[PDB]
Design a protein around this ligand. Structure first.
Ligand SMILES: O=P(O)(O)O[C@H]1[C@@H](OP(=O)(O)O)[C@H](OP(=O)(O)OP(=O)(O)O)[C@@H](OP(=O)(O)O)[C@H](OP(=O)(O)OP(=O)(O)O)[C@@H]1OP(=O)(O)O
Ligand SMILES: O=P(O)(O)O[C@H]1[C@@H](OP(=O)(O)O)[C@H](OP(=O)(O)OP(=O)(O)O)[C@@H](OP(=O)(O)O)[C@H](OP(=O)(O)OP(=O)(O)O)[C@@H]1OP(=O)(O)O
Ligand SMILES: O=P(O)(O)O[C@H]1[C@@H](OP(=O)(O)O)[C@H](OP(=O)(O)OP(=O)(O)O)[C@@H](OP(=O)(O)O)[C@H](OP(=O)(O)OP(=O)(O)O)[C@@H]1OP(=O)(O)O
Ligand SMILES: O=P(O)(O)O[C@H]1[C@@H](OP(=O)(O)O)[C@H](OP(=O)(O)OP(=O)(O)O)[C@@H](OP(=O)(O)O)[C@H](OP(=O)(O)OP(=O)(O)O)[C@@H]1OP(=O)(O)O
Lengths: 547, 547
């Protein structure tokens, strides 16, 4: 069972130089089927000798090659792109490890085959020839690879790692805790009690339901995204690959639950301070500023603490999203920019908070239209991202019809705002504008719903078969989930568009903010659900085509 | 390296019947140092033949023995102490597994030694004799042990386990989670916020600082005992052995943290309901009753849920403590009954709560002396436990001087109460009684302190050497701990006695309840500390002598 081990661990590149162990076993078998045995031993040992010679030659060649490579590498390092030199060093070390493995495999193989010969031929001169020719010859007796590996570890540690031996050991030959679950629980408990205190304080404002709706939607989105990370990692959907995250260290669901719990503790504490007004030297309007200043400082924290790698990945992702038509559209850039299409209320509320704190401390009506643009920003991002994807791949259908799906948000918002500004000023064409808004509402709702179900989710496939109205490969355990989500998306895709249109117009105040406050945390739920089946379709059928 | 494996895994009892592998290797070595080889092979194979014969005979004998044993076992089970029959079944199964291991070891050993002979003697007839005599003979070809083991598993599962195969697999051949840490965190968070709400409610009663001091001391004791369990398990101090707990499943520190956190949530909720009086159909005095009714129902919960095995171990332990002079003094019975010497305030407060709810809803003064007895109950327990240990072991010194250490609590409490009842009634002998109380206070304080430091802690040993003023073997990492604890115990052992004496007398009201409320959670801390070094001395020097 060494032949299988060899053929499985043999180096693809040097598949020749390895001892033809299977061929030697074939030779021995054919032999076992005085002169006969004598001449067989003669020819067989001649074959072993030329094999040993070949291994010696190849080992010497690649040893000299690695010697020169280490020489050029030490020169180029002495010259001072630095991470590129690090990568070259790691490649060289991997090559050295591979060659050492080759040497060990050949040694073990020679011993095993010679032992097989000894046992089969009932002759002890086999091990004699072993200890005579092998173990006294180069490619086994030589240890230059050992010292090369030693000097390489030393040089990377003292130049590149500057003395951090363990981190160098991680950089080379490289193959949720208890405290994090405890903190997830701590923050969920503090958050539960603070929410109960919040409800009890409310029982025993609209410029303050608009400044905390932002925080509420963001924290709900982070909790639900932690649930998404869990429900992906537990159905095998490799999100680590699709997002292009470092597969060694990435956030689990407990780290998202902990980030969301902490931000929720901050939100609840600020809201409480707004109710049970503590020390009255500082007014009420300072707690929203303190809350969002703390959130933004947690995001752009310069010191490498508190999820530094995660926060800065997110910051690069946001920079690449908001300056959209320039960077090439990854998948994280398509995912994020398609989840500001549901957190559009966070942008509306940031804009309203800026307005209010500047001018009202009017702002909720169309601030000359600055409130109808900041609503179409997260549809503009995706419109132009799909336009760039069409400019790159030059595939007309998916990307052009995608951009046509997001243009309907522009048209719907525009016609809602125009019909509003016309009805309040009592023009004649108000009914015409209302008809146009109704048409484009139906269009955008059906457009986005159809696209969701067909291209985003892959459902309604025609190779359905047993999985009625779905695709063939389903990853989620109970088939009720997909029907629940189909019904849910049909319902909550008209809700989202009606909420956008209503938030544009100033016609229905009161019922223009109990709607945009009871429909806004529903549409983050709808995005939390769409995440499941979009990432599933990306894993299975690669509908996005980012890899 | 098979000889070492054999000698390590050979059955102690049947050490003869196993193949003398080492002797065979000695024989082969002495041989390798035509007629010579021929006659050596003859005699060697004769030895192997008689060895095989011996193994066959012994295997047949023990197979018939196990057959009859299974027969008697099935009879006795058919007859219907039941757990005793279960234990007998497990013993039989272990014997069967041991005999099967014997068979496998002999097979492997015979193959290995015959292979050694084959390789050394350059003769292939070795494996021929192997396959001829062995593998065609009983003790290898027989499989009766397999079916016996099968029928045994089946019979235990269907009669004793009634169909629970996996639990039977646990009962035979038998060798903190994530959710528990999450719940520890949840309960600690809820508890933190409820305590902050508590302090804020108090800022914005003595019959109610006496009904919640019980709960507070109990919850503090459970938190600190969880810390004790951790600091034991992390310094290797085998508390699982000393307490005689089931070493397979015992409580970690996180389960004590979770029990204490839950009871603390109940305490804080009841106290809050006493402050922010909710629905006023139910008065205030119903929350203490609800709290302690819930705690007692959590303890004596009949259904097997919520730490059933732990709670019922504790209930048996308490039954064995409170009816003291009868049961033999284990170690858990000495530990518990020596930790009601510090939770004496929980008993005082239970008695005061009964008094109050019966008569005052007077009670805090000596209720005709029922308040000076319920203080000496947890010293009476230990007095009589040490008396029984002296009656059993008939070792005068440790147990008699122990009971003399606990009699001083009786004398101190008695003289405090008498001097009080004499001074308030203005007798002449009040100063005499005060002198007697002072004498016995000094006596009890110094007595218990000296005993703590010397016999309970083992410190002040005279083989100290480098560990000044301590013993030789220390288990706790930093030597500052032992000096901190020496100083702490010296301080807080006068505090405890002054608090007991004060709680006896009614002379210093106000300062008779800010003292018994600021000294009571200090003396549970002192017991939490004494736990560390008492259990350490029990692990190391076995000062208690319970095993
Ligand atoms: O049964 P055979 O003769 O056809 O197989 C051989 C077997 O001889 P046997 O009859 O059991 O005495 C063992 O030889 P041996 O006692 O000298 O042992 P050493 O090699 O010196 O240790 C050896 O097992 P092993 O002891 O290494 O584990 C095994 O090597 P290999 O495959 O690497 O083993 P596995 O990968 O299967 O474990 C041999 O080669 P194959 O034919 O390829 O299997
Ligand atoms: O060098 P900087 O500061 O500009 O950049 C970072 C680098 O700094 P440093 O070398 O320590 O001074 C490492 O930081 P760090 O040690 O805190 O992190 P670790 O504890 O080592 O994780 C980090 O290591 P690591 O994430 O690969 O393990 C590396 O990840 P990067 O290679 O992007 O990751 P991949 O592309 O391989 O996925 C970062 O980006 P680079 O610039 O590409 O190196
Ligand atoms: O070299 P020797 O003569 O001193 O040691 C023997 C060795 O010979 P070789 O290496 O071929 O020259 C191996 O023979 P073999 O491959 O035919 O045996 P198999 O039938 O294949 O098992 C065998 O290794 P291995 O194959 O079990 O892995 C080893 O078993 P042993 O170490 O007891 O077992 P472990 O203690 O390692 O578990 C033998 O026994 P010893 O003398 O006690 O060491
Ligand atoms: O039989 P009952 O009801 O009167 O007593 C219990 C027994 O009931 P059952 O057999 O299931 O009907 C088992 O309950 P269970 O299965 O819920 O617990 P498990 O899930 O199996 O743990 C338990 O098993 P287990 O603790 O040993 O594993 C056993 O522990 P006990 O032997 O004391 O422990 P040790 O003396 O060996 O330390 C209890 O005491 P016994 O009376 O001595 O058996």
């Amino acid at each position: 069972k060494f032949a299988e081990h060899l053929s499985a661990h043999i180096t693809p590149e040097w598949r020749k130089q390895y001892i033809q162990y299977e061929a030697f076993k074939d030779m021995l078998y054919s032999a076992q089927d005085k002169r006969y045995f004598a001449k067989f031993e003669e020819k067989f040992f001649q074959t072993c000798e030329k094999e040993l010679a070949k291994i010696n030659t190849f080992y010497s060649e690649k040893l000299a090659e690695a010697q020169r490579r280490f020489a050029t590498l030490q020169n180029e390092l002495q010259s001072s792109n630095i991470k590129d030199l690090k990568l070259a060093f790691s490649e060289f070390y991997l090559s050295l490890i591979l060659l050492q493995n080759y040497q060990n495999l050949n040694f073990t193989g020679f011993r095993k085959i010679l032992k097989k010969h000894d046992k089969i031929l009932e002759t002890s001169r086999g091990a004699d020839w072993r200890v005579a020719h092998v173990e006294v010859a180069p490619f086994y007796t030589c240890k230059k690879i050992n010292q090369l590996i030693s000097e390489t570890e030393a040089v990377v540690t003292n130049e590149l790692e500057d003395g951090d031996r363990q981190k160098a050991m991680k950089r080379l030959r490289v193959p949720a805790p208890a405290w994090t679950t405890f903190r997830v629980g701590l923050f969920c408990g503090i958050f539960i009690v603070l929410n109960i205190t919040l409800v009890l304080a409310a029982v025993f404002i609209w410029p303050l339901i608009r400044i905390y709706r932002g925080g509420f939607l963001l924290i709900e989105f982070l909790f639900l995204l932690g649930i998404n990370t869990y429900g992906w990692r537990q159905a095998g959907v490799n999100h680590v690959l699709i997002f292009e995250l470092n597969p060694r260290s990435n956030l689990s669901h407990q780290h998202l639950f902990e980030i969301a719990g902490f931000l929720g503790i901050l939100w609840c504490l600020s809201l409480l301070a707004c109710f049970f007004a503590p020390i009255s030297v500082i007014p009420t309007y300072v707690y929203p500023l303190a809350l969002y200043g703390f959130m933004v400082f947690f995001l752009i924290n310069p010191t490498k603490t508190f999820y530094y790698k995660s926060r800065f990945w997110l910051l690069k992702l946001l920079f690449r999203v908001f300056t959209a038509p320039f960077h090439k559209v990854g998948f994280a850039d398509f995912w994020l920019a398609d989840q500001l299409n549901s957190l559009s209320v966070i942008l509306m509320d940031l804009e309203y908070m800026i307005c209010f704190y500047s001018l009202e401390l009017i702002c909720h009506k169309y601030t000359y239209g600055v409130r109808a643009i900041v609503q179409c920003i997260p549809a503009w991002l995706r419109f132009i991202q799909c336009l760039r994807r069409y400019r790159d791949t030059k595939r007309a259908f998916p990307h052009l019809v995608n951009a046509g799906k997001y243009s309907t948000t522009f048209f719907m918002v525009t016609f809602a705002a125009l019909y509003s500004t016309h009805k309040e000023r009592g023009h004649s064409d108000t009914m015409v504008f209302f008809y146009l808004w109704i048409v484009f509402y139906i269009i955008s709702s059906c457009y986005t719903l159809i696209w969701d179900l067909k291209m985003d989710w892959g459902l309604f496939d025609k190779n359905a078969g047993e999985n009625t109205f779905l695709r063939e490969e389903i990853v989620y355990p109970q088939k009720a989930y997909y029907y629940c989500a189909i019904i849910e998306d049909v319902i909550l895709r008209f809700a989202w568009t009606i909420q956008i249109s209503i938030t544009s117009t100033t016609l229905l105040p009161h019922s223009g903010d109990i709607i945009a406050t009871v429909f806004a945390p529903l549409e983050v739920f709808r995005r939390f659900v769409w995440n499941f089946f979009r990432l599933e379709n990306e894993h299975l059928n690669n509908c996005g085509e980012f890899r």
